[PDB]
Each structure stands twice: as structure tokens, then as C-alpha cells.
Write a protein that binds this ligand. Sequence first.
Ligand SMILES: *[C@@H]1O[C@H](CO)[C@@H](O)[C@H](O)[C@H]1NC(C)=O
Ligand SMILES: *[C@@H]1O[C@H](CO)[C@@H](O)[C@H](O)[C@H]1NC(C)=O
Ligand SMILES: *[C@@H]1O[C@H](CO)[C@@H](O)[C@H](O)[C@H]1NC(C)=O
Ligand SMILES: *[C@@H]1O[C@H](CO)[C@@H](O)[C@H](O)[C@H]1NC(C)=O
Ligand SMILES: *[C@@H]1O[C@H](CO)[C@@H](O)[C@H](O)[C@H]1NC(C)=O
Ligand SMILES: *[C@@H]1O[C@H](CO)[C@@H](O)[C@H](O)[C@H]1NC(C)=O
Ligand SMILES: *[C@@H]1O[C@H](CO)[C@@H](O)[C@H](O)[C@H]1NC(C)=O
Lengths: 383, 383, 383, 383
Amino acid sequence: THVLRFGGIFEYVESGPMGAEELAFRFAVNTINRNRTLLPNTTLTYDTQKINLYDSFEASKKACDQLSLGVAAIFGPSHSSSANAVQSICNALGVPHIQTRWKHQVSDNKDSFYVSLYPDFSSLSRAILDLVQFFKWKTVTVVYDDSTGLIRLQELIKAPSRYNLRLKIRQLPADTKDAKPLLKEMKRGKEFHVIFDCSHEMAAGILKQALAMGMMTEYYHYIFTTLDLFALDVEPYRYSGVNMTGFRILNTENTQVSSIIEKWSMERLQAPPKPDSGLLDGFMTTDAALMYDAVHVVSVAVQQFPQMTVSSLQCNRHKPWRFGTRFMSLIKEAHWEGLTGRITFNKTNGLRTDFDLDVISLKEEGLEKIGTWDPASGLNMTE
Amino acid sequence: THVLRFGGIFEYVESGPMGAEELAFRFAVNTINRNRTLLPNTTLTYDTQKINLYDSFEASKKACDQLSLGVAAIFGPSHSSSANAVQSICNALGVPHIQTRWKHQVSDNKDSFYVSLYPDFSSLSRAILDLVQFFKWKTVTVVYDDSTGLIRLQELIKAPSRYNLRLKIRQLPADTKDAKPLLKEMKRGKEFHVIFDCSHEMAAGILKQALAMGMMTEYYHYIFTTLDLFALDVEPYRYSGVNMTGFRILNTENTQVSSIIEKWSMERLQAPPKPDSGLLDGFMTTDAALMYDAVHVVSVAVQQFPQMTVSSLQCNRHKPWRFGTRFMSLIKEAHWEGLTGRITFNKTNGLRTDFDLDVISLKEEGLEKIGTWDPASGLNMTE
Amino acid sequence: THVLRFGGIFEYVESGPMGAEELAFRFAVNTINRNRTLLPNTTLTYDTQKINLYDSFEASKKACDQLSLGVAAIFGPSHSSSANAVQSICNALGVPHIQTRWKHQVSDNKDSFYVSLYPDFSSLSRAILDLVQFFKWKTVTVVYDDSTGLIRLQELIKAPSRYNLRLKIRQLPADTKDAKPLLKEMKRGKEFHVIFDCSHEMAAGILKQALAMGMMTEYYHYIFTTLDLFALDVEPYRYSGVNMTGFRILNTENTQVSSIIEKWSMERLQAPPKPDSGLLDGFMTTDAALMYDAVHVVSVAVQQFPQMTVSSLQCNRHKPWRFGTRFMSLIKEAHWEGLTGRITFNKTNGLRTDFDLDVISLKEEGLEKIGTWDPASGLNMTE
Amino acid sequence: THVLRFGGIFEYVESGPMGAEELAFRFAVNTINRNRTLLPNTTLTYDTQKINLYDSFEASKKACDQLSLGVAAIFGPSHSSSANAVQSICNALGVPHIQTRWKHQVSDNKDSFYVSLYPDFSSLSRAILDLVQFFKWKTVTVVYDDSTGLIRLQELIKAPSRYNLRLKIRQLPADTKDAKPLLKEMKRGKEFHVIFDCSHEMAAGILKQALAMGMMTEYYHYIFTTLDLFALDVEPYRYSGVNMTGFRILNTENTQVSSIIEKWSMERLQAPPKPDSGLLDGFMTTDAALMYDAVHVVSVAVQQFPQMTVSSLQCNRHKPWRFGTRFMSLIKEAHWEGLTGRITFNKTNGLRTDFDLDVISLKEEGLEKIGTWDPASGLNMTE
Ligand SMILES: *[C@@H]1O[C@H](CO)[C@@H](O)[C@H](O)[C@H]1NC(C)=O
Ligand SMILES: *[C@@H]1O[C@H](CO)[C@@H](O)[C@H](O)[C@H]1NC(C)=O
Ligand SMILES: *[C@@H]1O[C@H](CO)[C@@H](O)[C@H](O)[C@H]1NC(C)=O
Ligand SMILES: *[C@@H]1O[C@H](CO)[C@@H](O)[C@H](O)[C@H]1NC(C)=O
Ligand SMILES: *[C@@H]1O[C@H](CO)[C@@H](O)[C@H](O)[C@H]1NC(C)=O
Ligand SMILES: *[C@@H]1O[C@H](CO)[C@@H](O)[C@H](O)[C@H]1NC(C)=O
Ligand SMILES: *[C@@H]1O[C@H](CO)[C@@H](O)[C@H](O)[C@H]1NC(C)=O
């Protein structure tokens, strides 16, 4: 057999229940080592470690401790500041780094030992621009959460340079969950079409706030850049007539993915979120799905090269892994059809710039897919 | 008494001369320890270390090595990826981290042991917006270089939501400094009023291709976010009739600052003499000036804290510096009349938001000051 | 094999290489000597002399010294006063005088033993007038350098009487090359269509001054009366948008002429262009081309007239040359397809009023022929 | 005693005895010697040679023959082509040259042994411009015969660049006195104000065709740049009501000048002017006056240089004249006052630029003096 171990750095929430990404990582390794189809002899081992996600030194220490122990891959923390340091450590010591969240990559950063399964926001911004094109929008407003959102929507912000759009870029107030003043100053300008660049939780929050204000009508259209739009309590919004739209990468249409999501929902019920939050119950966040997909993709990559040996690399001396370049290359060339559709990393840099999105809009019966999106092909509306 | 040591994580050069920031750090250390008035019974010693600035692991190792011996304050690197890791290390070990270049601040980063002397772009973008309001501009063409530039100037991009401006965001090519297609696109669109978010090295090149494209005429107006506009060889452009507004925080109008600049030029024994870069020769860059001011500000803060003994801190066992809190508080509330002017740091965060800018513009006799921008009083552009 | 001597007077260069005209004369003599098709049973030798080009006494003394030896034709100086003196001497002694530069001949002069190869500025100025008609110009500013430029383009100056133009004649500042005040006056007068009458060196200087003055835009159109427009380094102006226009008599399009130009450039190896001069390196000026063509035309003329034993001509005795009349008639009626196209001398006067010009213009890909001009056919502007 | 003789080169004529220039030269030579006040012990002797004025070889040979004999100074030919050769010979041999007619000056010709008594056509053109500004002209038609007229009236032609004058440059037909087509073109062009740069005989002819065309009305103003306008037969136009205007340097309004002119007219009894020519009778043209004044200027210069024993310079080998430099300085520093008013030579040029004109216009009588022009003050229009 094998004692292959994957390193995982996740958020530390002592007061609350276990995190979604870490629980999905455990679920994925359990599925991999239980299903007698992938990695028959190899059995995955847990090396979960918890950090605060906002202290790069703690994450660096945890990653160095993991690499000192037997670890074949690092599943990076979902924060830019921590993940940058973690991938720098991994690149220096040659261990592959896997990221399941978007991190702003510096153009001059010469790091090669990292692959991110979150869809690249260049392609996602192109998809949002294609949505804006399809609706014949002229004057639009963008409402982002963090300054990095401007980076996440640069291919859409740059559109008026070449297009005839009219961006009215706004931002939700920081350190405050109240989006009421922004909506108040937004209604005065008659902003019919709005693009929201916030997380699904705060997207639901601002939707509830707008409904309390009576903002949305039959004449208001919303596009959400979050991929967790399907996991929203849209029942208060069924017949309101709002033209809500968004993207979704979790391939819930496939029966296998649906069964996996249902098993996730029934297994993850120790401490569900509060019902008065605006999110459903039988749902899987796209970050958990991407963690599952990442574990499976790394399992596929290691399957083709079974002669690996797990080392005890130390951070004190830069010792590249004996098999770190080959494993990294196979991970970058690994293809797998999983929860978030087809996974294919770009060869130039390790990112998912080729993915299959589904455009889900608010019909009269919940949120239903109205087409697909493929970077090679473009918008594929069928209805 | 005893000697006092400072951190010196700087750029690494293969075979060329030391960088401007490193030389400014050394020059400042020499200035304080050669001056009787500043720290009479105290000697300043430098511990400069060279890194790639794009290897967060290398920066972390250098910071840990410096803190393993006596270092009282780390003047961290000049890149976001490395500066974040060094800042996290300094916060964990309770040593002040003084940074002289801009870096995106995460909204949920709980870091208290860091001071930035770069004029906060939250205020400098407001200054650019005040200029474009002064010139009665109804359409601008904000042009940036790196995606982080969007994070830099966000208070200027959110202007159409409150003003009647028309922004056309554009990005310079990343493959090479060949902006001729971009300048041709700007010329075709009759976009005369342009804002450049670049560096002086890149701004000089962009001006060169703008002259090559005939874009420097009596109709075009360029506003530069660079604070090194005075360091541009504007002889070919001064007679073109084009007015190129900008800013300058380096208080070159003062006589002590001018003398220090002259000494800097005299001691600069290795400068690029190539007559094709578009930059002048006898001028101190704003980054070197900010590093000089950083050393001086930390010197002033040290003078207010006698009996401060520097200990040896190990990254393996997280043990905060005993004198870190008092020294950090003294650095935060430190006022100094340095080369960049008044140096007062904000109290809530560590950023420098209150600074005295000097708006400059290009006339037939060169680049000359045409006013002064102050956050408290706005633009005092009355000549 | 009858021997033959060709007299020539050229500029005296105190140091370095000799003038381009003397090099062209020597190269043409060598080419005729090595070619057996031209002048088969004969030979050509040269008797080059050097003068200041401004001392008519020196030119007269050199011409008399050459006439003391047996010379068949004198290739006189390229300056008005010295050329006039040598032409009078040759007309008195009966030997032909071959001149390749424009020189004002007074109306009542009766000299017959002289022929000119420079395109007469009564047909060429008519070509600039035809270009002005084609461009539909209504306001034109003619800018010349020397006082003899008005007498040169007199047919262009006398245009408003017979057409509808707004000539605004201006003169380049004498004793200096800095035309910044003149260009500022032209810009203040909104004079966008300018016809420059200056040498290619001064043309390049004025182009540099206008680029520094912001006059290199799509608004400004410059017509150059110089025939060496191909020798200007238009790298900084091709992308500006100026539609620079001019002529080129040098038949560079031909393969034989291109081969001869390449041979001349390879043989030159002398007088490298100044880095900031603004001219090109491997291009031959039209003056050297006309000297080469003059030697070839006189070789053709003497080919048709064998047994011409050149005798000694005494200036003091003043005995006309025995073969002078018929040899000069043959030169005047000679025909030759040389470097500067077809070389046909007028019958009434010896000037060259019949020539083919290649109207070239500046595009984004450099200068390239855009039409053809012929005194009989007129403009044939077809790109 | 100390005998000094002057050499002169004039026109060769066969019908008339000798030209007016030589008449004035002989009159001056045999007047100064008789007047014992000027040159008490130095008899002036004329050495007259006659040339074709269009053969630079003949003029050069005659000048060399004269310089072989003892000659203090050469009174060069009244042409513009042989005068250049003679002045070059004089400069090379270091002998003063005196020119009484205007010839085109090469910009870079380094000659310092010539003085031109003809009022230079750079102050005369400014006088014409001041005269047309005084009359408040807007449409001006410049007419000339010799192309060199463009070089002469270049300051007048360069007027539209500064002011609003609309110059319409025209040229009289060459080799033909039937100027009717030009006058018809004027009639069809409705050109009312004309500036004639033609000789007095040609001016009278042009006035004759104008009267034949009925163009001597009250709406037609004629400015004549010629200084011999007072010599015209204006009786047939005296009551025509025209506004004919010109200039007059020949100070006829002086007792001594009037007596000298009367004596010259009395001596001129060999060839009366043609009765049917439009010219007066018994008058002295400005060229003869300039020659007479030139001889007196040289006499004043030699007054202070009484030791200049003439030499026997040969043209075969150039030998500078020992007395040439100081005699030339005295020539250029002689403020003699004669028929053409105050005679002062420009130190940096040698030409006469500071002269005193007297504006004359047609009235009920013949050409009364209506003003005075000086280069320093300006147009002193008193009338
Ligand atoms: C909103 O607009 C979309 C765009 O076609 C449409 O499919 C949807 O039915 C609309 N919803 C309404 C009108 O409630
Ligand atoms: C959409 O996708 C299908 C298959 O996924 C493909 O055959 C088709 O060409 C695409 N485009 C359109 C417009 O249907
Ligand atoms: C001069 O600067 C002003 C800014 O007040 C600008 O509006 C104008 O276009 C400039 N003039 C030029 C570029 O000729
Ligand atoms: C602007 O500056 C001038 C000169 O420094 C000063 O007199 C004036 O009071 C200032 N105005 C302000 C600060 O509002
Ligand atoms: C050619 O010149 C005209 C001006 O007559 C100008 O309008 C046009 O743009 C020019 N063509 C170019 C620059 O390609
Ligand atoms: C212009 O030149 C072309 C040759 O390219 C010729 O065919 C055409 O006839 C010419 N047009 C004239 C002479 O009008
Ligand atoms: C002009 O002529 C008058 C004639 O009386 C004279 O008094 C005056 O001094 C002259 N000059 C000026 C500048 O008026």
C-alpha cells in the first residue's frame, strides 16, 4: 500500500462547527480512499491544520511543519495574503500547491508550483461581459465588496474603452452589513441593471435589504458574479418579477454530482446555519465543491505516476522534492470531469481558464439554467 | 550607551549597483549617526539584506534571520507579496514594520505593527479627482499598468456614481513597453484628457511613444499619478504646448531638502547614463526619499524612547517583543519635517493619509509648481 | 585608345573625407572606365581641383589651370558665384561647362557652352504648384532658407494671380538653425499647410524642431521642394500622422540604379552621419546622383564624337576650342537614362526642364511613392 | 607729386560715346582734382575699361590688367554677375572694390573688400512697406521684371506673414515690352494698388501702356521702388488725378547738388534722350549720382591716407596689398555727404543701409516731396 498524505490548511473556528472547505477535504479524501476505482493501493491520510487566514506567518509555520512531516500536496488557505506565502514556500521547496479560491497573482511572480481550481476571473469577467452583451445593456452599475473585486472585474470595467457601456461603479460600506444607504443613493440615479460582486451570503443580505426597501420591481435586473447563486432562498422572489441572473459552475444537472451533493447535505448537518439567513439547506458551496474537485484531480494526477515517495523536506534548507517537477507537471496536465464540470489547467500559468459555466436566471419556478458558457465557444443560450 | 540596528530587506542585484532604496537607507543611517542633534547617545547600524522581492519565502527567511539577531524595526521590502509576509512576521514577533511603498491592505487584516509612508492612494486618488474637477473635465481616460492599479485609484473610478465624469479605463500592454496600439486607440476615440497610473520609468516611455504618435499637442492633457514627475526629461515635450499636470510630494522647494538631494546626487557614484530612458540625472526618486524619511521618523520615535534594548527573537517560538508596543505607538504618533514634507501617520490604521502635495505642471520653461493639495483644505491652486 | 580628361572643381575639405560630389565624379569616371560598352576604344581620366566654392577668383584660377591642360569638359563648382565665373570662362574658351546644381542665370546672359542637370526650378516649382492644386489647398505658407529661394520658387510665388491661394511666405532664421520662433509664429497663425524650400539637412533639422514644437499632428501637411526626401530619418514622424509630401528624381525603383546606389554606399566608407543629424546612412544624395549622371551624359556625348584630341586652352590668349561648338551641341542634344531618370536638356537653354519625378509621401510604413509627375503628362497620383 | 589713379570697369557701347556711369566717373575725377580743397596734392587719374557686363571672364581680365598697373581701387561694373567676379578678385588681391549698383549678396560669402553705395534692398523694402502701411493698403500687387527683384523686395513680399496685406506678385513679360497682358490681368483682377520694381525707362513705358489702357484714373495708386521716379515725364499724367508715389535719394533740393546736376546736364550734349520715350531731358539718373558720390567717398577716404604708393599686383600669383586693409577701413569709415545724401557704410556689411530718402508723389505739379524716410526714425510724412 501507500501512506500518501495531503497537507491541508484551513480556517480555525473553535467556537463554531467545522469549516465547509476542511469538511469537504475530509469528505473527498474519504471518497477517494473508499471508492475502489481511483488509487487502489494508495490510501490518503489527513494532515489538516488550522490558521486564522489573516496571518501569513501562522500559515507559513503550518505549511513548513506540514512539509517537515510527510506531505505530497498542500491545499492552500482561502485568503490571498496567506495563500501567497504558502505557494511561495511550496515553490521554494517544490511541493505542489493547490488553491480552491481566487488569489490575485502578481504578473511578475515567477511561481510555477501552484494550480488554482477557482475559475479565473478574467474568463469569468468575460462571461459577465457576455451576459451584459446578451441583454443589450447600456448603463450598468457594479457593486463590489473588496478592492480586489475591481481586479476581479477588470475585463468588464475596461469595456467602455472599447464598448458603449456606462459603468457606475459603487461599493458596499466596509465593516457594516447594512447596504441601505447604497441602495438609497442607487435608486435616485435610476439604476435598472446592477452587477453584484459580493459573496452569496451578503448577496442574499442585500437582496433582503432591497426587498425591505421595495427596490426590485419588474423593471430591475440583477447579475451576481458569485457562483453560489443557486444556493439562495429565492422563494420570496419567485413572482416578484425581478430579472435576477447569475452564473453557476456546480454541475447539479449530472445525477452523480447531485447524489454527491445530497450526501454532502445529509452528512453535513451537525450545525447548519440559521434558517433566517437567506441560504438553503440542501446546498454545497462552490468552495467546498472546488476542494472536493481539487482532491480528486490531485488523486488522478498521482494515479498515473505511482512510483512516488513522500519526503520530509525542511524549510530551513531549500531542498526541492525528488519528484516535485514531474508531479507538478502531471497535476497541471490532469483532466477530470467532476463537481465543477470539466477541469483543465492552463499550461502557461496554473489556473482554470477553460470551464463550462451555466447561466441560471430567476424564472417563475426558482432559478433555472438558460444556457451555458465556454471560453472557446462563448455564450450558448438555448432556453 | 548601545548600538541600535534596523531591518534592511531590499532588492537583490545580480551584478549591478545597489538599488535606490538601499542606498537611501544607508545614506539616512549615516545622516542620523553623523548628526549630534538626532540621537546624541545612540548609534544607528544597518542590516541590509537582498531578496528577489517576489519570493515571499525568501523575504520571510531574511526577516527571521534579521530578527534572530538584534533588529529594532524592519524597513521591509518594496513588493506587496514580500511586504505582506514580512509585515505578518513583524506583527507576530511584535517588531515595527516600516514600509515606504504602497501595498494593498486587506479589509480584514488585523495587523497593528506596521507603518506605511507612501502617501495613501485613498487620499492621492482624491487629489487626482480634485485636479480633474478643477480642470472642469467631463471625460477622462484613466490608464493603469498593473491590475493592483485599479485598487490604487478606486476613489477616482467611483466618481461617475457621484460626479458627471466619463471614465474610460485602459490597461497598458504587459508583454513589452510598446503602447502604440493603445495610444492609437486613444487617439481614434478623441480621448484628450488622460490619467496615467504608472511609474516614472514607465511614464517616460509612454510619453516617448505619445510624442511618436503625435499625441503631445495643444489638445491633449495628461495627469500623472507618479510622484516622480519632476524626474522626467521634459525638454522634448515642454515646447509642444501640452500641459502635463502631476504631483510632487518631495519638498524640493525647501533648502535643506535641496541640499540633501544635492548630496544624494554627489554620493550616487553609479547612475544609468543611457540617453534613451527619458529620465533626468540629478534627482532623487520618491522611493529613496520615502526610505530616508522612514529612517528619520523611526529615529525620532527612538529618541522619545530611551533605555530601549533590542533583543533576539526566534520565529520558531512565537514570543512578542517586550518593547514592541511602546515603540510602535511612538512610531505611529511621530511627526517629522522630512524630504517628503510633513510625516504624520493615521492613528486608526498605520497608513499615511495626511500629507502635503505640490501640484506641478508643464509650461514652456519646464515643470513648475502651480499650487498645493492638502486633505484638510483641498486644492489651493491659486498659483 | 584616345585619351580624354574631364575637369572638375569641388569643395575643398580641410580635414577628413572629400565631398560627396567629388566621390560621385570619381566613381562615375571609374565606372565608365571599367565598362567597355560605354566609350569602348577610349578612356576617361579626371583632373579634380578643390576650392572654397565661395571665392570666384580661386574658381577662375583653377578653371584656367585645367584649361591649360587638355580637358574636354569642366564639371564646375556647385555654388552660384563660382559656377557663374567658371561658366563664363568656359563659354569664352569654348569648352563645355557641366553644372549639376541649380544656379540663377540672368535673363540677358548669352553664354552657350553650359548645360545644367539639376531639375529646373520653373518646372519643379510647377510640380509643387500641381501638388498644391491636387491637395486642394487654399492657404499655403512657403518657408525658404536663403534669399535666393524666392527667386527659385518664383512660379509658386506668382500662383495667387492665376489661382486662389493665400501664400504667407516666411524665411528661416539666418545665421542659425533654431527655427522655434518661426514655428511658434506659424502655429499661432494656424498655418497647417507648409512648403519647405531647404536642403535635406535643414529639412531634417526643421522636422526635429517642429516635432519638439508639437507641430507633428494629422493637422499639418508639409511639402518639401528638396529632392532628397528619401534621405530623411522619418522614424519619429511616421506614426505622428503628418502627411509629409515631396518629390524624388532618383529612380530608386530601378534595379540598375539600386545596384549603383548600393555600390556607391559600399565604396563610400567615409563621413559617417552625425547621430543627431537626422539623416539616413546608406542613401546617396541627389547632388551626387546628378554628378554621376553628368559624367555619364558627357561620356555618351563624346562616344558619338570620336577623334576628339583635347588641346591646351590659354586663358590669356583666349583662343576658342576647335571642337567646342559641336561637342557642346552633342552634349545639349544628348539623351541618357541615368540614375535621375531620363536626362533630356532643353533646346533653347541648356537647363534640364524635362524630367520625371516620383511624388512620394509619408505613411505609417515610411516614405513610399504615391504618384508620378511629368511636365507633359502632369500629376499622375495613383498611389 | 603723389599721384593716385582709380580703375573702373563700365559698359562697352558703340552708338553712344560712353555710358552714363563712365560719364559720372570722368566728371568726378576731373572735378575733384580741379577743386584744390579736396586732394590738394593728389591728382586723380581715371583708368577706364569697357566690358559686356555679362562676360565675367572679360571683366576678370580687365580687372587683372588694371591691377597689373598701379590702381588704388576698382569701380566695378554695374552688373550683378561680373561684379561678383571683380569683387572676388579685389578681395583676393586686397584692393578696395566700390559697387554703385545692387547685386545679390551670398549669405555665406566672406568678402570684406567691397562697399556698395546703392541703398540696400533691405531698408528700401522696409521703406516700401512703411509707405504701404501709411496709405493703409490691403490689396497690393507687386510687379517686377528681373527675377532678382524677388530677392530685392523680399521684406515687402514677406508682409502677409505678419500683417493682413494680400500680396499678388506678378512679373512683366520677359524679352517683350508688350506688357498689355499683365495690365489686362490687372483689370480683370480689380487690382488697384501696384508696386513697380522696374527701372525708370521701364516705368515710363509701363505708365504709357497703362494710359493707353485708360488705367490712369483716380482709384489707382502706383508706388515705384525705383529711385529715378523724379526723372519721369509726368506731364501727360499730371492732371490725370492718379496717386503715383515713389522715392528719391538724389537730393535735388540742395544748392550744391542742383549746381552739380546742372553742370552734368550741360556737359551731357552728345546723345539726347528719345523724345518719344516718356523720359525727361537734361537730368542725372541715380546710378550716375551714385558713381559720382562713390568717387568722392573714396577721395575722402584717401584724404586721411596720403601714403599709398600704388603697387603692381599680378593675378597669376595672389599677393595681399599692404595698404589694402587700412584703406578699406578708411573707405568703410567715411561719412561723406553728397548727391545721394549722407553716405554711411554699415560696418558689419559694407553696404549702405543707413541712407536718407525723400518721398515724392504725383501732384498738380511734378512730383513734390511729401515726406522723408530714415531707417532709424521711420516714415516722416510731412507733406
Ligand atoms: C427578466 O428578463 C429575462 C431576460 O429575457 C427574462 O427571461 C425573464 O423572464 C424576465 N423576468 C421577468 C420579466 O419577470
Ligand atoms: C453550444 O454548445 C453545443 C455543444 O455543447 C455546440 O454544438 C454548439 O455549437 C454551441 N453553440 C451554439 C450556438 O449552440
Ligand atoms: C493647458 O492646461 C490646461 C489645464 O488648465 C488644459 O485645459 C489645456 O488643454 C492645456 N493646454 C494645452 C494642452 O495646449
Ligand atoms: C493658499 O496659499 C496662499 C499662499 O501660500 C495663502 O495665502 C492662502 O491663504 C492659501 N489658501 C488656503 C490655504 O485656503
Ligand atoms: C494626408 O494628408 C491629409 C491632409 O491633406 C490628411 O487629412 C490625411 O490624414 C493624410 N493621410 C494620412 C496621414 O494617412
Ligand atoms: C499613370 O501611370 C500608370 C502606370 O502605372 C499608367 O498606366 C497611366 O496611364 C498613367 N496615367 C496618366 C499618364 O495619366
Ligand atoms: C519730420 O519733419 C519735420 C518737418 O518740419 C521736422 O520738424 C521733424 O523733426 C521731422 N521728424 C519727425 C520725427 O517729426
